[PDB]
Design a protein around this ligand. Structure first.
Ligand SMILES: [Zn+2]
Ligand SMILES: [Zn+2]
Length: 48
């Protein structure tokens, strides 16, 4: 690949696969998606 990839906004050690509708954080997995929720107060429903 041409190395045109974005890193996980949370852990940033491989790549992203998700993108929180609120935080817009491109997470690598649901684990990183649920990671910001417990500290940033997020549910991930866009208008939660
Ligand atoms: Zn991650
Ligand atoms: Zn979020």
């Amino acid at each position: 690949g041409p190395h045109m990839a974005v890193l996980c906004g949370v852990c940033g050690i491989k790549e992203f696969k998700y993108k929180c509708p609120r935080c817009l954080v491109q997470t690598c997995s649901l684990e990183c998606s649920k990671k910001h929720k417990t500290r940033d107060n997020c549910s991930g429903q866009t208008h939660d």
